[PDB]
């Protein structure tokens with residue numbers, strides 16, 4: 023067992039000085055001057071903050087994608103997360119078109135077995151048929167999935183057009199599952215890619231131009247209004263644009279349950295990174311949605327402060343130089359993705375909390391609690407309370423770290439924040455009650471993490487249910 | 501020739517006392533105490549306002565549509581417009597899918613030959629191919645068309661999906677033509693129609709429920725952002741919802757050239773009309789988009805006052821009780837459309853000018869001049885100046901009229917403003933310099949109107965051209 027002693031507990035709401043005891047994977051007791059079981063290990067947290075471990079709901083460990091397989095696997099990725107204070111992930115099962123969802127799910131379960139920390143899956147709806155809708159039913163009832171991902175881009179691949187989105191959202195409603203969406207207009211992306219290639223703009227600087235912010239705002243508006251019509255909630259993954267954020271805020275003002283996810287990269291980087299003279303450097307930043315002109319970073323910070331963006335994630339999707347260089351002659355063939363699972367919490371703490379833009383409680387809400395609530399994992403996760411999973415991070419407000427591809431634990435040769443020094447770092451990370459990161463030493467073990475099931479019908483479905491009752495149509499009698 | 505003496509001339513900007521002389525179809529002279537050519541007729545405009553005749557850019561005379569043919573034909577419709585102060589129309593050629601655009605154009609020219617006043621056409625893009633793209637160019641270069649209509653609704657009929665919108669908008673840009681859009685999401689409409697019928701809601705009260713406002717807002721957002729991406733202007737036909745209006749306003753706030761059209765019905769009627777106990781009365785109001793909850797009418801008036809709505813029109817699409825009753829068992833089979841060409845200007849003057857919501861100059865801009873500008877007909881139309889077409893209305897601010905299906909000149913048995921009394925009416929209407937409406941007497945003759953060609957490249961394409969030059973992608977040198 024493990025007792026964290028002398029730290030200030032910081033939750034999504036409040037701060038209070040307390041000791042915390044963990045045993046048997048759970049938080050057992052919280053209070054001052056706690057009694058110590060015999061042989062219990064002790065961690066001294068004086069002058070530090072003790073928070074829930076981060077939850078990263080958007081990772082792509084060893085994703086086979088755009089020709090090849092991501093260089094980060096489920097072990098090295100979850101391990102790198104632990105070093106950065108992240109104690110659990112939600113990844114994506116991505117069936118090929120025409121491929122059984124259950125078959126892809128079991129393949130992905132095997133891959134994730136080596137995870138060093140708790141993990142779960144969204145399942146992507148990459149094609150539609152009657153059997154897909156049935157396989158969605160087994161995934162929810164039997165395999166602990168409660169959210170389904172829809173890609174609005176990738177025309178001629180996995181793009182879900184309006185009819186699939188409509189049919190799939192209706193299925194999500196019947197199952198009490200959360201629809202999630204990668205919001206970019208796939209038709210516009212395809213058109214711009216071919217226009218830019220025909221002009222000879224083959225380099226990475228054409229990648230931001232091939233999917234400008236209104237392509238994201240359009241798809242956000244469309245998924246949001248399909249979700250309103252069908253009566254489902256909606257989770258929009260990694261929002262990057264003022265356009266998309268303004269569509270989310272518009273829907274939330276109308277009482278619609280719409281959630282926005284954001285990456286640290288889109289809070290802190292602008293699209294000038296794509297104009298770097300060195301091809302490999304520019305290609306290192308290639309991901310979808312791309313990094314944006316500076317106006318959009320300020321807008322995203324406003325969404326965080328106003329409560330119109332709710333969760334942080336990383337889109338952790340690692341490709342090394344040789345893999346990126348598959349698109350050396352054609353930016354549209356660069357495998358999309360950047361690393362970030364190890365860096366998310368420190369980047370957000372340094373930019374948000376140190377500056378006073380965000381409270382420590384907002385930081386906790388944005389790194390674990392809101393994700394936990396949205397996907398029906400609260401208070402098992404994202405919570406410091408008796409009976410909750412003992413996933414915790416000890417945070418040193420005066421500690422320093424310099425992000426570098428040469429020193430990070432992410433199995434990739436590039437860092438989009440290379441050279442950045444942050445103040446405020448995770449000194450210790452606790453997962454399932456065990457100390458797996460301690461001041462420079464990572465103790466992750468392959469296979470230690472558990473598969474985390476997420477129950478259906480998060481509490482928003484209670485609100486939606488009564489709304490549908492109140493709005494039943496009544497015929498006119500004539 | 502015809503001399504209007506003693507009136508106050510009211511334009512889109514100013515008012516001043518002047519006589520106006522017309523001859524040979526044109527305005528020949530404007531001034532105080534004009535001399536009278538020999539044999540010139542004289543019309544006394546004392547105590548009245550002399551304005552450009554209304555332009556109605558949205559009519560559907562004798563449309564074959566939803567099973568049958570509209571009861572108003574090009575003569576009775578243009579004549580009814582004259583009695584109501586409207587001196588020219590723009591109608592729609594609507595080819596069947598896979599039907600030659602040129603073939604449909606010539607058929608519609610034959611039909612429109614009987615017009616009593618000037619008329620022109622938008623051409624609808626009801627299917628796509630290389631031949632459609634070729635015929636669009638011939639229509640612009642040889643037949644005086646400069647605008648192409650796209651229906652985003654009517655799934656499995658004439659719906660233009662994203663790939664058609666993209667390709668057609670690209671063609672409009674190449675030709676200097678204005679894309680226009682009927683903005684409703686066809687997939688959502690189809691889903692809601694079939695859901696409501698399976699619930700047994702077959703009556704007209706299900707029609708608004710089958711296309712609620714976010715269905716229009718989504719489609720507006722999508723056409724607008726396709727237009728931004730492709731670099732074209734965009735005209736959205738009859739906007740009815742705050743949602744769509746807010747998307748227009750959002751884009752215009754960023755400097756995008758987006759124009760909105762509105763009908764008097766959507767300014768003044770709410771959706772309670774569809775719950776009328778008499779089936780035929782409820783069905784009389786069935787049109788798309790449908791009339792909306794009251795909050796939406798106030799939003800549209802503000803869009804007019806703020807300059808985010810630009811034109812008024814009527815969607816003049818007449819079906820009598822028998823024709824409406826084709827959907828007696830199935831609201832989705834009710835031929836959609838209402839009458840308004842005769843009523844538009846008095847409805848707007850009485851509701852807008854008498855109340856102080858709109859100046860007389862805004863009334864002129866909203867009833868002719870903005871339409872003329874957008875479609876490259878200014879100052880030929882919508883203008884009181886030497887050399888402009890002599891299309892004029894003499895307006896009596898103290899004249900009264902009560903709108904009724906029993907007394908109107910529109911060849912249809914229903915008026916959506918039945919019983920409404922308005923103050924401020926056209927006492928005389930002048931088309932091509934001849935008096936065709938004179939204090940109760942209609943003197944319209946079939947064939948008197950001319951086909952009005954509209955030149956390509958309205959001046960907005962000049963700014964767009966410089967904008968695209970300045971924002972051209974530039975390659976990074978490596």
Ligand SMILES: [Zn+2]
Nearest residue numbers: 080082204337
């Ligand atoms: Zn992703």
Ligand SMILES: [Zn+2]
Nearest residue numbers: 558560682815
């Ligand atoms: Zn229409």
